[PDB]
Motif scaffolding. Sequence first.
Motif, PDB file in Angstrom:
ATOM      1  N   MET A  80       0.864  -1.169   0.000  1.00 53.70           N
ATOM      2  CA  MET A  80       0.000   0.000   0.000  1.00 53.70           C
ATOM      3  C   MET A  80       0.906   1.226   0.000  1.00 53.70           C
ATOM      4  N   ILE A  81       0.804   2.038  -1.043  1.00 51.85           N
ATOM      5  CA  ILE A  81       1.525   3.308  -1.107  1.00 51.85           C
ATOM      6  C   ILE A  81       0.634   4.388  -0.507  1.00 51.85           C
ATOM      7  N   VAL A  82       1.211   5.227   0.357  1.00 50.40           N
ATOM      8  CA  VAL A  82       0.466   6.272   1.058  1.00 50.40           C
ATOM      9  C   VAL A  82       1.338   7.514   1.162  1.00 50.40           C
ATOM     10  N   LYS A  83       0.688   8.665   1.358  1.00 49.27           N
ATOM     11  CA  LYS A  83       1.441   9.902   1.538  1.00 49.27           C
ATOM     12  C   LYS A  83       1.829  10.147   2.989  1.00 49.27           C
ATOM     13  N   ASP A  84       1.124   9.540   3.939  1.00 43.65           N
ATOM     14  CA  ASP A  84       1.414   9.708   5.356  1.00 43.65           C
ATOM     15  C   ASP A  84       0.911   8.477   6.095  1.00 43.65           C
ATOM     16  N   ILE A  85       1.511   8.190   7.253  1.00 42.90           N
ATOM     17  CA  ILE A  85       1.082   6.986   7.964  1.00 42.90           C
ATOM     18  C   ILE A  85      -0.240   7.200   8.681  1.00 42.90           C
ATOM     19  N   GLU A  86      -0.717   8.438   8.745  1.00 45.49           N
ATOM     20  CA  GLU A  86      -2.040   8.707   9.380  1.00 45.49           C
ATOM     21  C   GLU A  86      -3.108   7.883   8.666  1.00 45.49           C
ATOM     22  N   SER A  87      -2.976   7.767   7.356  1.00 42.55           N
ATOM     23  CA  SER A  87      -3.961   7.003   6.602  1.00 42.55           C
ATOM     24  C   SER A  87      -4.005   5.557   7.075  1.00 42.55           C
ATOM     25  N   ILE A  88      -2.838   4.922   7.205  1.00 44.38           N
ATOM     26  CA  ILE A  88      -2.796   3.538   7.674  1.00 44.38           C
ATOM     27  C   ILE A  88      -3.326   3.440   9.097  1.00 44.38           C
ATOM     28  N   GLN A  89      -2.883   4.353   9.965  1.00 43.05           N
ATOM     29  CA  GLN A  89      -3.268   4.300  11.370  1.00 43.05           C
ATOM     30  C   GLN A  89      -4.774   4.435  11.529  1.00 43.05           C
ATOM     31  N   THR A  90      -5.371   5.376  10.804  1.00 49.75           N
ATOM     32  CA  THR A  90      -6.804   5.597  10.926  1.00 49.75           C
ATOM     33  C   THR A  90      -7.578   4.396  10.405  1.00 49.75           C
ATOM     34  N   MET A  91      -7.124   3.811   9.297  1.00 43.37           N
ATOM     35  CA  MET A  91      -7.789   2.611   8.817  1.00 43.37           C
ATOM     36  C   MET A  91      -7.614   1.473   9.815  1.00 43.37           C
ATOM     37  N   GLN A  92      -6.475   1.421  10.507  1.00 42.96           N
ATOM     38  CA  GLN A  92      -6.270   0.367  11.494  1.00 42.96           C
ATOM     39  C   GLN A  92      -7.106   0.571  12.754  1.00 42.96           C
ATOM     40  N   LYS A  93      -7.738   1.733  12.916  1.00 40.29           N
ATOM     41  CA  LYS A  93      -8.650   1.981  14.027  1.00 40.29           C
ATOM     42  C   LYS A  93     -10.094   1.663  13.681  1.00 40.29           C
ATOM     43  N   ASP A  94     -10.408   1.589  12.389  1.00 38.96           N
ATOM     44  CA  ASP A  94     -11.754   1.395  11.874  1.00 38.96           C
ATOM     45  C   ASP A  94     -12.275   0.038  12.335  1.00 38.96           C
ATOM     46  N   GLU A  95     -13.286   0.043  13.204  1.00 33.09           N
ATOM     47  CA  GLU A  95     -13.758  -1.205  13.790  1.00 33.09           C
ATOM     48  C   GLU A  95     -14.391  -2.108  12.740  1.00 33.09           C
ATOM     49  N   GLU A  96     -14.983  -1.527  11.698  1.00 30.52           N
ATOM     50  CA  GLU A  96     -15.515  -2.347  10.617  1.00 30.52           C
ATOM     51  C   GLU A  96     -14.384  -3.021   9.848  1.00 30.52           C
ATOM     52  N   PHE A  97     -13.325  -2.267   9.540  1.00 34.17           N
ATOM     53  CA  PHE A  97     -12.117  -2.866   8.976  1.00 34.17           C
ATOM     54  C   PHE A  97     -11.620  -4.021   9.839  1.00 34.17           C
ATOM     55  N   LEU A  98     -11.544  -3.806  11.155  1.00 32.95           N
ATOM     56  CA  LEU A  98     -10.974  -4.817  12.045  1.00 32.95           C
ATOM     57  C   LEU A  98     -11.856  -6.058  12.125  1.00 32.95           C
ATOM     58  N   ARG A  99     -13.161  -5.876  12.308  1.00 37.20           N
ATOM     59  CA  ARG A  99     -14.024  -7.044  12.450  1.00 37.20           C
ATOM     60  C   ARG A  99     -14.198  -7.795  11.135  1.00 37.20           C
ATOM     61  N   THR A 100     -13.992  -7.124  10.001  1.00 34.18           N
ATOM     62  CA  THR A 100     -14.184  -7.743   8.692  1.00 34.18           C
ATOM     63  C   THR A 100     -12.957  -8.543   8.261  1.00 34.18           C
TER      64      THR A 100
END
Lengths: 128, 124
Positions: A80-100
């Motif tokens: 995954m290419i990103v401009k900042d790690i905030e994007s990864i971190q925020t997606m890693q907090k997403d409870e729907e992302f996590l439970r899915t």
Amino acid sequence: PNRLLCWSIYVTKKPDQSEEDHHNHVSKVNAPMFIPFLKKYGIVRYTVKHNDAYSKPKQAALMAGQPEENVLAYDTVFEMIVKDIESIQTMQKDEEFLRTTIPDHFNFADMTRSKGSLTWIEEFTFAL
Amino acid sequence: RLLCWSIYVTKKPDQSEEDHHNHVSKVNAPMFIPFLKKYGIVRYTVKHNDAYSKPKQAALMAGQPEENVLAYDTVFEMIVKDIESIQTMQKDEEFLRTTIPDHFNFADMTRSKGSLTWIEEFTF
């Protein structure tokens, strides 16, 4: 600095899972499951790298007789290419992302033999 | 299917991090990129695991053993349409003379690895 970043997951396939079932699950289930989340959180580019029956003869030719220990053994690499790690971190907090996605790791990944990597990249694209 | 040829590089043991990445970016790259275009490489990427990226990496991997982190200092990646592109470049006499030997200036070959994969890509 204005440097793109690459978040990579190096995946060993689940024990006794066949190559074919591993890559079918990755391509037809897992990667599709991530796409909506990746879009939502601003990922620039998503690449899945496969080390399987299609690539292995090409690898063997390029390795030309070298020992097998010289070959990186992971079955799939997710990038995954990103401009900042905030994007990864925020997606890693997403409870729907996590439970899915968490229950899905058991279907294709030996996570004890898998690794992560966050690098900064320099890229040269040669298409005119 | 597009292909990715990757070399996972551990720096020379007595080479500093900063000198390793400076050599790769400022010495090797200007020599190498001419050949990559000449032989039709689609994309060349250098991934750097250095003092700039390592704190961001540590934030993403916090709460896990450091051993869960890929340890290579640099990863070299070229996307190609076919391996014939790579094989033909490897026979380029100038490439063989000036650029292939450069890896002795930045890679511990005893701790470096290669990988040819096929790729699936999505760009948002």
